[PDB]
Design a protein around this ligand. Structure first.
Ligand code: FMN
Ligand code: FMN
Ligand code: COU
Ligand code: COU
Ligand code: COU
Ligand code: COU
Lengths: 359, 359
């Protein structure tokens, strides 16, 4: 089966094509991860996936989505990941991390605690920053502060510091979070970026924050470890052909700038959209990006049906299949997939103390 | 559903009737548990089961089954359990432990490393002890040394020390391992106990080691925490009616001696048996013990089909249903069961960072 073929990118080899995408847990305290994360991540790694990407981890305190978000904005924050990385490696999975800045979507409640911007007088909240002083709307009505050029330089450096820390903590795979309406996505989108300086207006200017951040990170991230990004390539906002064309052009620039793989997503930049949800719905758009930018891709949404994951790989729509919620339901989803797809000795997807008894 | 009704025994309340029975991992080193066990057990606890019983944990080095067995024969061994117990409690499951001595079945290879007695000249092995100098046979040919009265006193005290350590490490549930052909079972069975002193011959004498050990443990184990045992009540050796009658009589004595619940098993004392394996096959024998000894029971073997677990509870065959291998396959089996049995808000069997997204 295609799903269980290994994959090599730079010096890193994944044992199969199952990636666990970043999934926020909302369990950190002042950015510091804890035994919630340790057990969650080590357990996932033991389930058999080839790659485990740690949740959106904030490069700066104000770049958390919520008060429960993980952070890597100090060396002490980074140190907290060391034992988890080591446990992921012990289980034979590749440890990755998504480094992030939530931009105008920051300072929000946890999803089971209202999912909305935190009230102004709640002592947990903070001022958000963005390309322009324009609110997302809906459940995220807070108007962000327009970034200064010095803010832009500082956030870029925060991404570099985060990547350097990720490297030194032992991560073997990094993903820059340029998707889902957060800071990077919001610099790219005309909906959110009304700047008239070097960082807004034209395609080149809207691309600039993303490209400069990638280039700056590339200076500290080892060339032998995959350098990746997540990027929303359309919005389902009635401007999809134009948006896709620009996004694919930016993907070509990312590739030329050393990006090894793109995780293809939806932008979620604004709320007034009409996303055609369905199992594997992203496959055709991922395939178009893959083909037109000639860049390896992953995508997600509904690939927990193992036959869908297999079909996407066989059709060359994807290079890796990201499977999120199914792993929250069953940490050992990769074993279920192995059985479904008829992998010989399927139980040996798991470590010996499980595999021996399930065979 | 019956499976998701809470259960109170002494001062302890289980959130549902799902018990995870002891399952050896064979991952300890010189008896010391490690991050294998931490993540395994914490992950299981988060999956939703009401009770998690830690694997057979040796009361003495020679009472390990294998070189990978957990031990609790020193305070330093016990300390290693403290963070795991605390993680189990944090997840809302009740932490239990099975304390054990493998008797003539000790000094064996791990199951995926031959499953047989360790060769005499292998530096990992050790002399086994038992009631009588008689081998199990088959893959366990080693003849054990016949215990002296001082050996008997010492092993009893090792069980007391183990129980005291379990208590002080924060366990809320203890299970004495008097099943599966190990030391305790082998004192009860005429197949393995040919002693002609106070510890063999008559029913009273064959019962004596088990009853004295229970009584000694009872002196240090808090009266407000469940005191339980696992015991093989028949062998499927052509002597089942006689063996069951004696085993039920011993169960009555255990109850009179403060036993709160019996985990009903098969003896596995000798290899030449004909066990009628099948899904839930133990239900009727568990029910007979429950009824005739008027004692709460659990049992196992094939209850990973949630409807079977439900039916056994509704028929009053069992008070708790133990589900073993299905939890190795899927740590979140209790969530699967909740869905199968139509529990409202089934995903909230799991903690918020999972439940919110699966609802
Ligand atoms: C609990 C949860 C948290 C998520 N957190 C992130 C995250 O940190 N970064 C990100 O880019 N996407 C995040 N996502 C999106 C997932 O990575 C994924 O794309 C999505 O869940 C769809 O895949 P699935 O159908 O397999 O779950 C999250 C999704 C879930 C359910
Ligand atoms: C990996 C493994 C290890 C076990 N170790 C123990 C143990 O430590 N003590 C014990 O009394 N039974 C042990 N057992 C038996 C289980 O507790 C249980 O009775 C059995 O697996 C049947 O239940 P199941 O069909 O749900 O797996 C073990 C079983 C397995 C599969
Ligand atoms: O980038 C993100 C971060 C969190 C999150 C939670 C649910 C769904 C999607 C998400 O995307
Ligand atoms: O897959 C594995 C195999 C062995 C192991 C040992 C310790 C911790 C984690 C492990 O994961
Ligand atoms: O008491 C025990 C201990 C280990 C074990 C392993 C497999 C099956 C049954 C077992 O019982
Ligand atoms: O079920 C839970 C809920 C919360 C929690 C926090 C830290 C560690 C484990 C936990 O388990």
């Amino acid at each position: 089966s295609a799903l269980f073929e290994p994959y090599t990118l730079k010096d890193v080899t994944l044992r199969n094509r199952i990636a666990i995408p970043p999934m926020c847990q909302y369990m950190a305290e002042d950015g510091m991860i804890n035994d919630w994360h340790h057990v969650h991540l080590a357990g996932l790694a033991r389930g058999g996936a080839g790659l485990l990407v740690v949740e959106a981890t904030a490069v700066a305190p104000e770049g958390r989505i919520t008060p429960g978000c993980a952070g890597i904005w100090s060396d002490a924050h980074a140190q907290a990941f060391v034992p988890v990385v080591q446990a992921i490696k012990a289980a034979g999975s590749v440890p990755g991390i998504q480094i992030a800045h939530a931009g105008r979507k920051a300072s929000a409640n946890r999803p089971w605690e209202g999912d909305d911007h935190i009230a102004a007088d709640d002592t947990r909240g903070w001022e958000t920053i963005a390309p322009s002083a324009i609110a997302f709307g809906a459940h995220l009505p807070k108007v962000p502060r327009e970034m200064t050029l010095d803010d832009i330089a500082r956030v870029k450096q925060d991404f570099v510091d985060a990547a350097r820390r990720a490297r030194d903590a032992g991560f073997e795979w990094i993903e820059l979070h340029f998707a889902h309406g957060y800071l990077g996505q919001s610099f790219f989108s005309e909906h959110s970026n009304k700047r008239t300086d070097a960082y807004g207006g034209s395609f080149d200017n809207r691309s600039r924050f993303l490209l400069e951040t990638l280039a700056a990170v590339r200076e500290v991230w080892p060339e032998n470890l995959p350098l990746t990004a997540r990027f929303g390539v359309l919005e389902y906002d009635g401007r999809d052909e134009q948006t896709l064309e620009e996004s694919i052009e930016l993907a070509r620039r990312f590739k030329a700038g050393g990006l090894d793989l793109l995780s293809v997503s939806v932008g979620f930049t604004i709320p007034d959209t009409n996303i055609p949800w369905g199992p594997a719905f992203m496959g055709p758009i991922a395939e178009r990006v893959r083909r037109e930018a000639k860049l390896p891709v992953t995508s997600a949404w509904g690939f927990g049906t193992p036959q869908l994951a297999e079909a996407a790989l066989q059709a060359n729509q994807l290079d890796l299949v990201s499977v999120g919620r199914a792993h929250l339901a069953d940490p050992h989803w990769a074993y279920f997939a192995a059985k479904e797809l008829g992998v010989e000795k399927a139980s040996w997807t798991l470590p010996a103390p499980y595999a021996h008894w399930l065979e």
